[PDB]
Amino acid sequence: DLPYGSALTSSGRISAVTEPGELSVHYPFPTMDLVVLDDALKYGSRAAKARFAVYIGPLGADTAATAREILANVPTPENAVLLAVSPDQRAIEVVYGADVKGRGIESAAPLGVSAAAASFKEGNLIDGLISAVRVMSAGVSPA
Amino acid sequence: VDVEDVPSAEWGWSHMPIGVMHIGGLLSAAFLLVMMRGNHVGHVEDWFLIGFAAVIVALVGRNWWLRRRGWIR
Amino acid sequence: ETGIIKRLPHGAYVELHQPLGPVDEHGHPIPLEYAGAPLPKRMNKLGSGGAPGTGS
Amino acid sequence: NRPNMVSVGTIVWLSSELMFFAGLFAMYFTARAQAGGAWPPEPTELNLALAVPVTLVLIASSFTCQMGVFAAERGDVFGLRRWYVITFLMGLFFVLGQGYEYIHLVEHGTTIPGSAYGSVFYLATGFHGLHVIGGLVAFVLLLARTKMSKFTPAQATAAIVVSYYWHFVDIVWIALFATIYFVR
Amino acid sequence: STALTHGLIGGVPLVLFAVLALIFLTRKGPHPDTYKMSDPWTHAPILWAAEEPREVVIGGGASGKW
Amino acid sequence: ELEARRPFPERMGPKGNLIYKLITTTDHKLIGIMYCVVCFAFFLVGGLMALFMRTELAMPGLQFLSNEQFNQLFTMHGTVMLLFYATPIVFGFANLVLPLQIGAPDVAFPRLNALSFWLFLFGALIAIAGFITPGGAADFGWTAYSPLTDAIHSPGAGGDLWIMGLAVGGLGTILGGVNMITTVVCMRAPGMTMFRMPIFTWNILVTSILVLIAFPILTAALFGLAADRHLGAHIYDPANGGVLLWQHLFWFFGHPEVYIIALPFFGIVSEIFPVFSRKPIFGYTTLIYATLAIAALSVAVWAHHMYATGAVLLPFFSFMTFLIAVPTGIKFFNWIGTMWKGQLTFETPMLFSVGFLITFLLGGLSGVLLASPPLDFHVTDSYFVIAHFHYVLFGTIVFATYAGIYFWFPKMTGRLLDERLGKLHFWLTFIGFHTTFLVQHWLGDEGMPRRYADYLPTDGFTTLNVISTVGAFILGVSMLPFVWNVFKSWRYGEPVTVDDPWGYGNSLEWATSCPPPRHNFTELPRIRSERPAFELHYPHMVERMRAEAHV
Amino acid sequence: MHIEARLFEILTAFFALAAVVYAVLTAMFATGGVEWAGTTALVLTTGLTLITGTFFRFVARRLDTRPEDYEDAEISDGAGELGFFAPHSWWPILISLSFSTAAVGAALWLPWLIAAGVAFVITSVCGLVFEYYWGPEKH
Ligand code: HEA
Ligand code: HEA
Ligand SMILES: CCCCCCCCCCCCCC(=O)O[C@H](COC(=O)CCCCCCCCCCC)COP(=O)(O)O
Numbered sequence A: 001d002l003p004y005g006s007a008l009t010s011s012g013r014i015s016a017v018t019e020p021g022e023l024s025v026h027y028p029f030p031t032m033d034l035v036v037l038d039d040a041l042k043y044g045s046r047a048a049k050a051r052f053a054v055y056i057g058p059l060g061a062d063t064a065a066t067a068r069e070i071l072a073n074v075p076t077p078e079n080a081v082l083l084a085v086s087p088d089q090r091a092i093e094v095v096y097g098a099d100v101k102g103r104g105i106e107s108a109a110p111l112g113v114s115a116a117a118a119s120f121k122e123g124n125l126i127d128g129l130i131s132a133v134r135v136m137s138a139g140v141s142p143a
Numbered sequence B: 001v002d003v004e005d006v007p008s009a010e011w012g013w014s015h016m017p018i019g020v021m022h023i024g025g026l027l028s029a030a031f032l033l034v035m036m037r038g039n040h041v042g043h044v045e046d047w048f049l050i051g052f053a054a055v056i057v058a059l060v061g062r063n064w065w066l067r068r069r070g071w072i073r
Numbered sequence C: 001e002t003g004i005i006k007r008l009p010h011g012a013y014v015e016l017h018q019p020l021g022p023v024d025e026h027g028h029p030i031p032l033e034y035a036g037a038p039l040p041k042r043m044n045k046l047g048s049g050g051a052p053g054t055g056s
Numbered sequence D: 001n002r003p004n005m006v007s008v009g010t011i012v013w014l015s016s017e018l019m020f021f022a023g024l025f026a027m028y029f030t031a032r033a034q035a036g037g038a039w040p041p042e043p044t045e046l047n048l049a050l051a052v053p054v055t056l057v058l059i060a061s062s063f064t065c066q067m068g069v070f071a072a073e074r075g076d077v078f079g080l081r082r083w084y085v086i087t088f089l090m091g092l093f094f095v096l097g098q099g100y101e102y103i104h105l106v107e108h109g110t111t112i113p114g115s116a117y118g119s120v121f122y123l124a125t126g127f128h129g130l131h132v133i134g135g136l137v138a139f140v141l142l143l144a145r146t147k148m149s150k151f152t153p154a155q156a157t158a159a160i161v162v163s164y165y166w167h168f169v170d171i172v173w174i175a176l177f178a179t180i181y182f183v184r
Numbered sequence E: 001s002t003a004l005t006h007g008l009i010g011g012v013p014l015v016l017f018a019v020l021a022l023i024f025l026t027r028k029g030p031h032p033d034t035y036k037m038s039d040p041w042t043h044a045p046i047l048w049a050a051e052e053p054r055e056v057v058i059g060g061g062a063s064g065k066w
Numbered sequence F: 001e002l003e004a005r006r007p008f009p010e011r012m013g014p015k016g017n018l019i020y021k022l023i024t025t026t027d028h029k030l031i032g033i034m035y036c037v038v039c040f041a042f043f044l045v046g047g048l049m050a051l052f053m054r055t056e057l058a059m060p061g062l063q064f065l066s067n068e069q070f071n072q073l074f075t076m077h078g079t080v081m082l083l084f085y086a087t088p089i090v091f092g093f094a095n096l097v098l099p100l101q102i103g104a105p106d107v108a109f110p111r112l113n114a115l116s117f118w119l120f121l122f123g124a125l126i127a128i129a130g131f132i133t134p135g136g137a138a139d140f141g142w143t144a145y146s147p148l149t150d151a152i153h154s155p156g157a158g159g160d161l162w163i164m165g166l167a168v169g170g171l172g173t174i175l176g177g178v179n180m181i182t183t184v185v186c187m188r189a190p191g192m193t194m195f196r197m198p199i200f201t202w203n204i205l206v207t208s209i210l211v212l213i214a215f216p217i218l219t220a221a222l223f224g225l226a227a228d229r230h231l232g233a234h235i236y237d238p239a240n241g242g243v244l245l246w247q248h249l250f251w252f253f254g255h256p257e258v259y260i261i262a263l264p265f266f267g268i269v270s271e272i273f274p275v276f277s278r279k280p281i282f283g284y285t286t287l288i289y290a291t292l293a294i295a296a297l298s299v300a301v302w303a304h305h306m307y308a309t310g311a312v313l314l315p316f317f318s319f320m321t322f323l324i325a326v327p328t329g330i331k332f333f334n335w336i337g338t339m340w341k342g343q344l345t346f347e348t349p350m351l352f353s354v355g356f357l358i359t360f361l362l363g364g365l366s367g368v369l370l371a372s373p374p375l376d377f378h379v380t381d382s383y384f385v386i387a388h389f390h391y392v393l394f395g396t397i398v399f400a401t402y403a404g405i406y407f408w409f410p411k412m413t414g415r416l417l418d419e420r421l422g423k424l425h426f427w428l429t430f431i432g433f434h435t436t437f438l439v440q441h442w443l444g445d446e447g448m449p450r451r452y453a454d455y456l457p458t459d460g461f462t463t464l465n466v467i468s469t470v471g472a473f474i475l476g477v478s479m480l481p482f483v484w485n486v487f488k489s490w491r492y493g494e495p496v497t498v499d500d501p502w503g504y505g506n507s508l509e510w511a512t513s514c515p516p517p518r519h520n521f522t523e524l525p526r527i528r529s530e531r532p533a534f535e536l537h538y539p540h541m542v543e544r545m546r547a548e549a550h551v
Numbered sequence G: 001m002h003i004e005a006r007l008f009e010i011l012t013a014f015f016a017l018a019a020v021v022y023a024v025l026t027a028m029f030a031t032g033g034v035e036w037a038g039t040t041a042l043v044l045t046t047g048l049t050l051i052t053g054t055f056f057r058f059v060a061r062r063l064d065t066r067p068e069d070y071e072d073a074e075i076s077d078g079a080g081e082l083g084f085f086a087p088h089s090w091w092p093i094l095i096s097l098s099f100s101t102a103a104v105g106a107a108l109w110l111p112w113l114i115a116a117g118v119a120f121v122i123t124s125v126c127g128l129v130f131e132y133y134w135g136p137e138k139h
């Protein structure tokens, strides 16, 4: 089941390899744009004391229910905010943990969706996520 | 500053405004350049002052540009 | 950090650590809070070196 | 079992030290071949009435140093201290004995700038004397560490490797003593 | 001459740098092309999360569609 | 199966993540990293010294440099670029991968390993500090022949600082060599026998032995030289026979020293050829024997630099020098055999290694020409030598150094250097070096000696010097792409999420994460050959390698 | 560690042969007799490998087959504590600074600076040796 050149070590870790001249990450976005998104995610969560998550991919038939299961994979789900975007389904779903409730997220959740959507009509995916993270993180108080 | 940058942020003075250091850097280079007005006849020291002033100006400009573009905070 | 390196049966290299406080479920301890006081970093300062022996 | 990492490191470094004395020996032998018949030339007059008793003291220091090694392996820290203190005192006598011989040689006209023989003689023996002084510092540092903590096998290893340096120093002097005071 | 000597020393390295740079720096790197909204999402699902703060009941959420 | 990951790896640590680590580190990985930065700082500093010399030897006459300044220039250039750049980076790569190659968590003496770095750094700075003195730095050449280095002929403090700066740096090299021998003997992982280590580890252990034979004798010779200048001793007096005495000891140091900065870089390419050829290293057992023969032969050939003195036994050293050409030739045939019937992709680590084979051979051919005293009687102390040793020292301490850096950068960073920028740097370096050092073969043969600040227009050396000057500046501008690549790819490079970014790594460092943890290993695979990583990553090839090992 | 000692013995034999041959080849053919500076180095070069080789021989005959000396050894065979390795220390940089101070004094021939450097070296070396052995303060 492991990919070519990948092996299972004695401790359970996976020792993978890549062909020379190839990339191990190959995210379909520019490197500089990824840095800006990381800065928005790292600094936004820091100023809010709540972990911020961004998901890109399919959301099944019902987008609302899919994001609930996805948030479980985010570290510390109780204090995590997940932003799910499905380019094929053209839907935006925002889900947050129990600890985030009562912290001012209810007024920023539609703010992030509208801000992300406005940039999504322009063909900018990374820019929309960056804008959504900034406004959503700016409306969340520490702890 | 916050805890992750300076762990002892609440234990004492840990933040210095960037404007003071940026303006001080420009004044540092300005003081290096004005010292060329002297009684020395040689120009070897003059080129050393120019190089140090240029290095300081370049560092200040590099930091200001990075801060403006949001690469560093 | 005690400075003692131990090789696990699967080949993992780990360094023995001496917790300064209580420990959680497994080996790793619960992190303490800074109190503005110096924290020991040498195991010899904690008395691990013992005493040479009473006498001249 | 296990190879002693500290002992391996000390032995490997000790072999390198031998190449340092190889340069000093080369200078003495090169100058000796150019003597033309007088080696040592006037007014240098080496005496065996002082070099031999001082050389024997350094040789006897190896036996006392080895006795401390046996105590160190036995776990007797106090026995290690007793034998190393005696070794330090007799090792110190070697420096004082060599220094006393230097004073008389200088007063008789044998100096570093005075003669080419004085240069090869003083640097060869003087650099060895610096090694003896460095060995005496090692004895004091190791003895000071014995009163800081309990006698551990790591502590006993440090005693053994120090004796390796002392044995190397004593062996080097035997080569220097035979080359200078006998092969004239 | 003295003008030709100084021109070659200061000119050839700059000319060679420009010619060689255009050969390699204009090539396409291993980085994948930027995703476009018109194209379908053929990439694997991506989950991004920040490492801060250092270390399941859902309090609610919001929906949207563009 | 969704795992949370950052969009990009952290560019740099927070404030105060490095400064206290730099002066208190015992980790060989960080110490090895500090070597490369300082080694390249000295590489750039020493390279600027040659540019001033090269730009002065462009047109006949002293335009902007005096005789004394030019004399100081090549002395300091050679001293910095052989002892302050080439020798330390031998241990720079050794502190990087050698504990990883043998499956060790650290070096034998972590404290002593850190002492070598600081001792070297402060020793190198002392020698360079002679420039700020009014008299200037050393102006007698890196071979510091006697009695030129004498107080009467070299009375300035720049020469004195040069002598003591080498002694401090030499002590660090001896301690580093001591650490490497102990680490190889004692810190090997279970299942890693002596004949199962990578070739690079074999070369470093062999090189460390050469350090213990050469550097202590240099320290002894320098101390005797310091006695003459300060105590007025007659150690190197010409009437006493010290003219030959100093040269013999210095060359007993020197020729083992050039192989100290040759064998490890032979090992570096020996780790890169199998990876990018998808083939095992050819003649693995033979390469070890060749390395041992080279190390042994390099000790009794010290006097072939002394042919023109007319005071050495020519038949003995000429024959022994010719013997070194055989094991060195075996290494090329093993390296060519490694690439034979393979699958070459020619990445930047592979591209630099290929340039090594072309560059080194021409310098090696010139070495055999100089090995014969009759041919050396005309080209000794001339630019034919300078062309020979900048083909043999640039084939290794630069081409192999760059190949190892591009090879091991993702391992110690988690980021990949740009390949497009790497290819530009390699081609610029190749073209510049060839342009600036091919014509110097004709210059030395025409009758132009080395260490000459000025030449007459009627000498006929102007045309070739201008061509060499053009190529040298190409080497200078070739540093910008590499420096930019290292500066950018360190923080904004392509992330490495796999143990082996090159796919077909053989040594044990490719079995751990990039970058490796503090103790270099969270697991260890079974070691049954010289390629444990290849066996682990490709279990289905274990049977094929055993059956097809022998032709 | 049979192979480790065999490497130094192989070098020992070649160095001994070269030293003997070159000495006997310069005594009857080199101008001026034996090349001394040159021969002395070769003879004592053999001693460098002889001392290390002999010690490795004695060590090998005492200890049995190590896990790293076993052709087919398992990773779990080497499980256990390896030893003590220093995690961090700022003493080495002080020793280098202390040694460099004496070197500068020796280069410029400053007796006061040489004496300070020697005292600094002893003080810095003492800290390195006693770093992991100083006991708790007795107050
Ligand atoms: C590793 C060894 C090594 C390396 C890499 C080099 C590199 C170079 N060397 Fe050198 N050289 C020697 C080892 C080496 N050298 C030795 C041993 C001697 C004999 C010493 C003696 O005679 O006593 C010698 C002497 C020597 C000579 C003959 C001396 C004579 O005239 O008698 C010449 C010929 O011009 C030369 C030229 C060059 C050039 C053009 C480079 C090019 O590689 C250099 C170009 C590199 C650069 C890096 C350019 C700088 C770029 C910059 C951007 C500078 C900016 C820097 C800062 C701002 C800090 N060197
Ligand atoms: C990496 C550094 C390095 C290396 C590897 C070498 C390798 C060799 N060197 Fe050299 N050398 C220097 C660095 C180096 N050298 C320096 C720095 C100086 C002068 C410094 C100074 O004076 O300031 C110098 C000077 C020097 C001299 C002194 C000349 C003089 O000063 O007049 C001599 C004399 O013989 C010499 C010869 C050789 C030989 C025979 C080899 C051989 O090892 C090379 C052998 C390699 C091959 C032979 C190629 C592989 C073989 C084959 C492909 C088979 C071909 C077979 C045949 C031709 C029979 N070199
Ligand atoms: C200078 C000693 C003279 C006596 C000669 C006999 C040698 C025995 C010395 C025993 C010393 C005991 C000190 C001790 O254990 O205290 C230790 C602390 O003292 C030291 O560290 C002293 C270091 C001395 C450095 C200088 C050496 C100079 C050498 C010069 C050589 C020519 C133990 O302290 P503690 O028990 O922890 O309180």
Ligand SMILES: CCCCCCCCCCCCC
Pocket (backbone or CB within 6 Å): F430, F431, F434, F435, F438, F439, F463, F467
């Ligand atoms: C990349 C290889 C460059 C080689 C340059 C050789 C130039 C030789 C010119 C000779 C001119 C004689 C008048």
Ligand SMILES: CCCCCCCCCCCCC
Pocket (backbone or CB within 6 Å): F362, F365, F366, F438, F439, F441, F442
């Ligand atoms: C190992 C021999 C190398 C020879 C290089 C020769 C370069 C060509 C120079 C041509 C000069 C024409 C005047």
Ligand SMILES: [Ca+2]
Pocket (backbone or CB within 6 Å): F055, F056, F057, F058, F059, F060, F061, F062, F063, F454
């Ligand atoms: Ca000119």
Ligand SMILES: [Cu+2]
Pocket (backbone or CB within 6 Å): F255, F304, F305
């Ligand atoms: Cu040679």
Ligand SMILES: [Mg+2]
Pocket (backbone or CB within 6 Å): F305, F308, F380, F381
């Ligand atoms: Mg010559």
